Amino acid sequence: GLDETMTEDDIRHGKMILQVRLALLAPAEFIAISLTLDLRD
Amino acid sequence: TMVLPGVSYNETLLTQASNDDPVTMPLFIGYTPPPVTVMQPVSVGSLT
Lengths: 41, 48
Prior knowledge:
This is part of a larger assembly, with 2 copies of chain A.
Chain A: H1 8-11
């Protein structure tokens, strides 16, 4: 945008600027097991 | 520097089970009727 990336100085420097966002996945490498008997009488 | 999945086994438990109440238990504290100790309480199944 106008002053979201750029300014008139970069308009008169002819820059054409954008901000690129991305959120990230992750692989599931390790196995943190916990057990619970849960008496059930 | 590396590492395996680490499957991480564990478990849990149970057992409140404690119940006894040996307050209602009597103790016969006599002499020996004429090879026991002179000192120890001895449980009794029966008179038989």
